[PDB]
């Protein structure tokens, strides 16, 4: 995240950190995600696309730091990894960039509620906040686009949703942004999501609840004027999510 403040997981208790194991001894951070129900986390397909080998990913909940432990954290394995059939990438956008990870602990359980682990709410069928609404994004992504390391402390910032008319303007992204995406930026292009924040949540309040309105998906540069961050429009995937998720 560029700008923003450093936080702790109590402030984003539904944030999931996804890492990959390497034959050699190291685990590296891959992307962020959000907990929907006790056994399912949602992220972006582009994070797995290149290495869809579920056995090699580890998911942690209750984590405020990237490579040091946080007390109360939970580690899980990915029992199922569902990528979107119809996922596409072009010279900028990712289409249908949503994925589901069903988690299983080494004891056979899903997430347990704590002060650092909570689920986030899903919107209702095609229901979104109005442009102007301030939403918060969270993650361990870069703090500057030129960095080549990620922060060790979790970050969060606030951006506002902008309309499709504004985002599809030729000097922004033109028709690379579709109806299944949402764009959010800082009025003064000072804070934004960036590489390493992929898969994480764009949370806004809708009808009284903190709702997962978008998933960090792509953007040109980071915190670049007239280059908003584009997020997957969760409200438009509800049928898809439903057809794959079940029980507690």
């Amino acid at each position: 995240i560029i700008g923003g403040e450093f936080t702790t997981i109590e402030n984003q208790p539904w944030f999931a950190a996804i890492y990959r194991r390497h034959r050699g001894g190291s685990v590296t951070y891959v992307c962020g995600g959000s907990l929907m129900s006790p056994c399912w986390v949602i992220s972006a397909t582009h994070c797995f696309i290149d290495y869809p080998k579920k056995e090699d990913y580890i998911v942690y909940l209750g984590r405020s730091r990237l490579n040091s432990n946080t007390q109360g954290e939970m580690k899980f394995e990915v029992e199922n990894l569902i990528l979107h059939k119809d996922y596409s990438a072009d010279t900028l956008a990712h289409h249908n960039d949503i994925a589901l990870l069903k988690i299983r602990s080494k004891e056979g359980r899903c997430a347990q509620p704590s002060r650092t682990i909570q689920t986030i709410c899903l919107p209702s069928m095609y229901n979104d906040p109005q442009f102007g609404t301030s939403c918060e994004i969270t993650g361990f992504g870069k703090e500057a686009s030129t960095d080549y390391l990620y922060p060790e402390q979790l970050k969060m910032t606030v951006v506002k949703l902008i309309s499709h008319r504004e985002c599809q303007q030729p000097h922004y992204y033109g028709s690379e942004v579709t109806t299944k995406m949402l764009c959010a930026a800082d009025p003064q292009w000072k804070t934004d999501s960036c590489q390493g924040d992929s898969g994480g949540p764009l949370v806004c309040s809708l009808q009284g609840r903190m709702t997962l309105t978008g998933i960090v998906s792509w953007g040109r540069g980071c915190a670049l004027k007239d280059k908003p961050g584009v997020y997957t429009r969760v409200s438009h995937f509800l049928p898809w999510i439903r057809s794959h998720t079940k029980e507690e």
């Binding site: 539904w14 909570q118 709410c121 949370v203 609840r209 903190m210």
Partner: peptide
């Protein structure tokens, strides 16, 4: 206790 979506404590 149990999950309450969207609640920070």
């Amino acid at each position: 206790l149990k999950f309450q979506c969207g609640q920070k404590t």
